[PDB]
């Protein structure tokens, strides 16, 4: 009902539920896979935007406390900790606090493919171990991602204009100190 | 993209078929007898658009009535003595005066409806008394040919409580005066506590008269309140009572350490009567009379007889944006007034802000050339000076303190995207009912762009030019972070650099220097930027050591570096010598700065250059690196490597090596022409790492922008080419204790000096970083006149024979243009609300929209804004000068910036198809703004994913130069 | 290529940690009985650590495993070996940015940091004199401050072992303003976590039930058998927030005087009457104002039950005065001063 939708009457409707699971947390940690089953339930209701910082500053804090020792209950196995960490991230300012509970993730370089007016289409992820300068061509990178075109060399436009100026003999410019003088 | 994000806009109504009539009264040189107020209240109850105002002639007041379709009953709503003087329809044209009055008429009905929905008004704000309780302010503008639109500004304010019996009880026992918010206009008053009862005879009549104009609910009735030392009985329904990024600095600190109805009736004709089109914010001198005063402002601002100001100027709003914004002191004082009050405060502040060598300044502006590096508002005083007029007018009927705190500071005392849009959809029914008694909700950019009567797609991303092989390469700007992996090469042929480092004799700082520059050499050479080896003489890895202590830092600095810069071949036997066959390396002096002043360090460079032979001095550069980089915490190395390469500026050769070996010939003719006295010295050609790729006679476009420093003593200017090939900056001294016309003449000479060094016709587009003045427009119109630009074309022909034969080679000027950039501060777009990639997080986008912005519908200077265009950009803008955001400081922090670009001169086809030569002023802006976006992509830091800052590159360098002068001076 | 006939992040991170683990062992045992092998270790420790830092910024080796090894090296530091610790403190400052992005690592780091600070005290003024202990205290206090500021979800709590609050922890010198601002932010955030921890202490779950707790302990035996433990000789000898909780216990039985028991209802009056018996300045308050509100049905004297139950209260009121709990001299001087200002 909340996700498809008496402005704030449902907030207290859930803090009693928080008191329910606050009472029966000790029952939850007794089993092994039952730790996850009501761990995941509260995830989908938080991420939906049912509660934000402006609604109840303390409300958000209360669910976090429960979340720390559900994860601390994994260690006290470590592997079970990872077993659920991969199952928690597989779905995904308020997000800053949520991700702090999970472990540090692996980072990969991202390249932005333009694919042409000349707009941007997609983004590609490449591991940082494939980017080395020993190979002459680009193995992970493709030149067609950036819309590369090879064009023949030409003399610089600025250099040529200096040469063509020799036939003109216009007025001599100011010594660049004429501007920084009293009026 | 932002083509589906929600704005805060509402297409209120359509002006087709509208009709209006004007009724005028003349009086002597009680509200029931008055015909203007009796008719205004009577038509307001019937819910028809009505508005009244005063006229220049004393004792003259006029009432306007707007309606749609069928006429209302005019035999009853109009008093007997009132006589009409104007009967117009939409097909007969809508002047600006009518346009500004229609906006207030809509706001009159809108204000009435809002108070019926439990909204209380405090000045410009409408808030709900006790988050989804947010204050919203309405401003109007006419968008499109005939559609009338509004923009809602939503802000967070502290809670406000309606006055009740409980509040009064504690006031009587309180010795201190009780502070409360009064009126729809937010007056500041003290609650005396002498509450009234509705049964009283006085409040029977007082409330009865109040109900005629404002909708008052229906028990407490009224209360005595004292405002600004003047007491008055005021109804208790309208009274209100108020409620009354570090981790990095900290850890850096650590690293450093260890290593009454009559009164409110008059006010509504002065404070809220000003409801003008927001498109005409960028305006200047009145074209009709060549003055800064016009329209009906002669009655709102304290003779001369202006005649029929048809244009859209409004001096009331001119003083708002032209008080602290970057303007010439000569132009600003005209807007305010020297003889009147507040003229001395501006002069006193300017002098108090103030309270060396010429060649030092020239060195300073060379370092910023590279691509990589209170006052009470006048409009507020106007409201305070309006209190005295209204209160003294009101007090007469009954028979410094006021200017200080007449108005409650609640409106001056200060988010999320979901909650804001919740109120925006909440406000749609209110707007729907008010006009109807349809309206589109918060418009997306696509809907906003579609009804402008003119594509909502983002501007295309330009491609760059690089060198992969010995040939060129057209590459996307997103491939810059992989410069080393793809082994690309820049322009300028990899200039070679030999460096000297000055380091103190501290082991901790010495050891770090060797490793840092060893890493710098690797990244410099890994990129195809050339060779970064030190000076060929080997003295302990090319590091020179030194040894209050700045004096010790200078003696060895000058005594050592001054003079310093002033047959077996086993493997060679196999290969023969190639032959004699047919560019000295640049010298860079790296300076480490132990100090956490700097000029003390730059004083070496001033002393070294004078004691050096000319050929060595022509290529010598200085770089200063702080000592904290070596010790404490890489993207710094890539930025430093590219900055050093860009600053090289390889000099033009002084000899051709023809070896004529004969009396005379074509080779000698080039040589003797190369050494002519009129040829300038130190050409110093500029070659950047990359330039914009060309896009399909020959010409060029010069983009120049300028702004004054924090003091008006200096004019800072910068320039760039169409493709970013050239980039130069200038500083002009204007310090007189006429003062600006000479300064602008020097600037125009500098711009003329650049175009005349080429051999192809140019096009000039002039930009202004801030708001254009009212005198600068007059001065620029004289310099950039048709007669003038044509005259210098003929004067050029006389001097040069070569220009005489071929006109395609003479560096004449084909067109001129003046454009001013300033923020808007009225519209806001939230990227979070929608309707594969998420634009604001990982990409930069930019949309534009330009329209002719005519003053009315259906000699040298025409109307003030010729054409106007919005500049919506997701990418952040750099640190702008403080006066840039003075008008609308709230828009400074929003992520998608709104900027306004205006046209002022547009001199087309001087010599007699490019967009700059089209007489349609809308085509000129979309060409200038499109090139403004394209030049903004040259700011993409190779160490960074996207462009570091918004706008054109020339604007960005000018801003960097402004802060550099500000910080060190 | 040859192994084609595996995550590079995990394997290459393990090699560096194993290689760097050997360097620390060499340095530690050689300081206690300069040797040449230390210089060989020092050069390789200095360079390889700088190489690992660069690869960390490049994101080439796994962050979680590398950071986990760092804390394992910081928990093996011998007690009192500040020197060895000092050559490792800059590792914390360099990697302080990514420590606050996880709660597992911050909790491990805070418990290491809090315990170490307590050992050094047995305060800050004497330590700052020593050039050796000058950066350690500031380094340790700064890493603890930035943990809660950016990562509050990681804080029973590590702060339990620390006797001093982070609000008044020693701070680097220089700016008076900045230091005061950050101190205010730190103290308010510390209070935020202090109340959050209390809230979690009750697992997200007054005076009437207190007597019911004491009812069952007497009910374990027979009430007829007057045991030896009801007397205060055992209670007061082994002992001498109980005064504030016992004022309700005496009065609640007193108003419910329909139950009997008088000669066994004075032993608890002996407990708290001795604290105020030596008076012959402060005065016990809010006592008599409570009781006169609980007087029921004063308007109607037709019912005899409201009279005799109130008559029992006066007898309870008479006997409590002789126990000397409600003082009279400071009460009557207020009554003396009540009419003095009226005249
Ligand atoms: Zn010429
Ligand atoms: Zn005009």
Curated annotation (Swiss-Prot), chain A:
Q: In which tissues is it expressed?
A: Ubiquitous.
Q: Where in the cell is it found?
A: Nucleus
Q: How does it assemble?
A: Component of the Mediator complex, which is composed of MED1, MED4, MED6, MED7, MED8, MED9, MED10, MED11, MED12, MED13, MED13L, MED14, MED15, MED16, MED17, MED18, MED19, MED20, MED21, MED22, MED23, MED24, MED25, MED26, MED27, MED29, MED30, MED31, CCNC, CDK8 and CDC2L6/CDK11. The MED12, MED13, CCNC and CDK8 subunits form a distinct module termed the CDK8 module. Mediator containing the CDK8 module is less active than Mediator lacking this module in supporting transcriptional activation.
Entry function: Component of the Mediator complex, a coactivator involved in the regulated transcription of nearly all RNA polymerase II-dependent genes. Mediator functions as a bridge to convey information from gene-specific regulatory proteins to the basal RNA polymerase II transcription machinery. Mediator is recruited to promoters by direct interactions with regulatory proteins and serves as a scaffold for the assembly of a functional pre-initiation complex with RNA polymerase II and the general transcription factors.
Disorder noted: Opitz-Kaveggia syndrome: X-linked disorder characterized by intellectual disability, relative macrocephaly, hypotonia and constipation.
Q: Which family does it belong to?
A: Belongs to the Mediator complex subunit 12 family.
Protein name, per record: Mediator of RNA polymerase II transcription subunit 12
Q: From which source organism is this entry?
A: Homo sapiens
Tell me the gene name.
MED12
Curated annotation (Swiss-Prot), chain B:
Q: Where in the cell is it found?
A: Nucleus
Domain of life the protein comes from: Eukaryota
Residue interval(s) of motif LXXLL motif 1: 360-364
Provide an example Pfam family for this protein.
Med13_C
The short motif LXXLL motif 2 is annotated over 421-425
Q: In which tissues is it expressed?
A: Ubiquitous.
Q: Which residues form the signal peptide?
A: none
The record ties this protein, via InterPro entries, to: Med13_C, Mediator_complx_sub13, MID_MedPIWI
Q: Which function does this protein serve?
A: Component of the Mediator complex, a coactivator involved in the regulated transcription of nearly all RNA polymerase II-dependent genes. Mediator functions as a bridge to convey information from gene-specific regulatory proteins to the basal RNA polymerase II transcription machinery. Mediator is recruited to promoters by direct interactions with regulatory proteins and serves as a scaffold for the assembly of a functional preinitiation complex with RNA polymerase II and the general transcription factors.
Q: Which disease is it linked to?
A: Intellectual developmental disorder, autosomal dominant 61: An autosomal dominant form of intellectual disability, a disorder characterized by significantly below average general intellectual functioning associated with impairments in adaptive behavior and manifested during the developmental period. MRD61 is characterized by global developmental delay apparent in infancy with mildly impaired intellectual development, expressive speech delay, and behavioral abnormalities, including autism spectrum disorder and attention deficit-hyperactivity disorder.
Summarize subunit and interaction data from the UniProt record for this chain.
Component of the Mediator complex, which is composed of MED1, MED4, MED6, MED7, MED8, MED9, MED10, MED11, MED12, MED13, MED13L, MED14, MED15, MED16, MED17, MED18, MED19, MED20, MED21, MED22, MED23, MED24, MED25, MED26, MED27, MED29, MED30, MED31, CCNC, CDK8 and CDC2L6/CDK11. The MED12, MED13, CCNC and CDK8 subunits form a distinct module termed the CDK8 module. Mediator containing the CDK8 module is less active than Mediator lacking this module in supporting transcriptional activation.
From Swiss-Prot, chain C:
Where, if anywhere, are coiled coils annotated? none
Tissue expression, as annotated, is: Ubiquitous.
Q: Where in the cell is it found?
A: Nucleus
Q: Subunit structure, per the record?
A: Component of the Mediator complex, which is composed of MED1, MED4, MED6, MED7, MED8, MED9, MED10, MED11, MED12, MED13, MED13L, MED14, MED15, MED16, MED17, MED18, MED19, MED20, MED21, MED22, MED23, MED24, MED25, MED26, MED27, MED29, MED30, MED31, CCNC, CDK8 and CDC2L6/CDK11. The MED12, MED13, CCNC and CDK8 subunits form a distinct module termed the CDK8 module. Mediator containing the CDK8 module is less active than Mediator lacking this module in supporting transcriptional activation.
Similarity comment: family membership: Belongs to the Mediator complex subunit 12 family.
Q: Which disease is it linked to?
A: Opitz-Kaveggia syndrome: X-linked disorder characterized by intellectual disability, relative macrocephaly, hypotonia and constipation. Intellectual developmental disorder, X-linked, syndromic, Lujan-Fryns type: A disorder characterized by tall stature with asthenic habitus, macrocephaly, a tall narrow face, maxillary hypoplasia, a high narrow palate with dental crowding, a small or receding chin, long hands with hyperextensible digits, hypernasal speech, hypotonia, mild-to-moderate intellectual disability, behavioral aberrations and dysgenesis of the corpus callosum.
Q: What function does the entry list?
A: Component of the Mediator complex, a coactivator involved in the regulated transcription of nearly all RNA polymerase II-dependent genes. Mediator functions as a bridge to convey information from gene-specific regulatory proteins to the basal RNA polymerase II transcription machinery. Mediator is recruited to promoters by direct interactions with regulatory proteins and serves as a scaffold for the assembly of a functional pre-initiation complex with RNA polymerase II and the general transcription factors.
